[PDB]
From a paper:
[name] is a globular protein with approximate dimensions of 55.7 × 34.5 × 23.8 Å. The protein has a butterfly shape with a central beta strand (T77-P89) that supports two lobes (lobe A: A2-R76 and Y201-E251; lobe B: A91-Q200). The central beta strand is hydrogen bonded to three beta strands of each of the lobes forming two 4-stranded beta sheets. The [name] metal binding site is located in a central cleft assembled by the two lobes. In DaG20 [name], the cleft is decorated with positively charged residues as seen by the electrostatic surface potential calculations. The pronounced positive environment of the pocket must be an advantage to enable capture of the oxyanion, even when the extracellular concentration is low. Moreover, one chloride anion, arising from the crystallization conditions, was found at 3.8 Å from R118, indicating the propensity of the pocket to attract negatively charged ions. In this GsTupA-W6+ holo form, the central cleft volume (363.9 Å3) is four times smaller than the apo form of DaG20 [name] here reported (1480 Å3). The apo-form model was created by refining the initial BUNCH model with the SREFLEX program. This approach revealed a slight opening of the lobes (RMSD of 1.5 Å for 274 Cα atoms) yielding an excellent agreement to the [name] SAXS data measured in the absence of tungstate or molybdate (χ2 = 1.0). The SAXS data corroborate the hypothesis that DaG20 [name] is a flexible protein that is able to adopt a loose conformation in the free form but, when binding to molybdate or tungstate, switches to a more compact fold.
The modA/[name]/wtpA gene encodes a periplasmic molybdate/tungstate-binding protein (protein A) which constitutes the first selection gate from which cells should differentiate between Mo and W. The ModA, WtpA, and [name] proteins differ in their binding affinity for molybdate versus tungstate, primary sequence and oxoanion coordination chemistry. The present work reports the 1.40 Å crystal structure of the recombinant apo-form of [name] protein from the sulfate reducing bacteria Desulfovibro alaskensis [name] (DaG20 [name]) together with the biochemical characterization of three variants: R118K, R118E and R118Q. X-ray crystallography and SAXS, reveals that [name] architecture has a common feature with other substrate binding proteins, which is the existence of two separate lobes.
Numbering used by the authors: 2 to 251
The structure:
Amino acid sequence: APVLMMATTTSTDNTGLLDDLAPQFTKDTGIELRWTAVGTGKALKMGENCDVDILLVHAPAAEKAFVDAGFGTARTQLMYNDFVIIGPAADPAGVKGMTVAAALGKIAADNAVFVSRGDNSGTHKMEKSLWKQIEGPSPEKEAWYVQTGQGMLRTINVAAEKGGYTMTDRGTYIKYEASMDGNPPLKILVEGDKILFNQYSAIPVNPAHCPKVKKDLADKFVNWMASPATQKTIGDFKLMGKALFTPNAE
Ligand SMILES: [Cl-]
Ligand SMILES: [Cl-]
Ligand code: NA
């Protein structure tokens, strides 16, 4: 009764995608998928310690280092979710429909309130990376730049209280927008930019590093997830009725 063991991330688990996919994978392939959801570093460490057969993660540089170490065979890209910048509907900096770089530069130029996670999360790291691409200086010392040291929902709530802008994953936005009966005060103002993509890949753990790894089960999962039918299933997945993942297997 074959069992495939996966390490993935807390954010992944929170979307609920695997709760939908896993019974379909078992129907189609006979293989039971078990997963543990941890931070990215810890997931990678689980693969390095031979704890699991496959990773499903969303951190391209660390993933490339994992493969280069010989701990994984290769990255297969599968889908992405995305990040958005939100702010008051009135949009006091006037950034709606700008690119990320123009919006962040404009917020910086207008000294508009911008709220960071400030907690070294994956989301925080993504937000910091965005600033690295404006022409102007790092915002970290500016009084308009707020660092909560809190999670995503809390940080959204501070941006709402302050009339501020913030970067969020779309999933948490969708849940927050539903908590305000579809009419929160903060709206999605910047979205679609390629830099805001959160690319997922699967990586089989390498049998040269972990000789008892269930490579053939891992490869079956990759095959399944990259198939047109499961791609379509990922693209049709909804969170509270709204789209979250774009399939993009090669
Ligand atoms: Cl623009
Ligand atoms: Cl959070
Ligand atoms: Na300034």
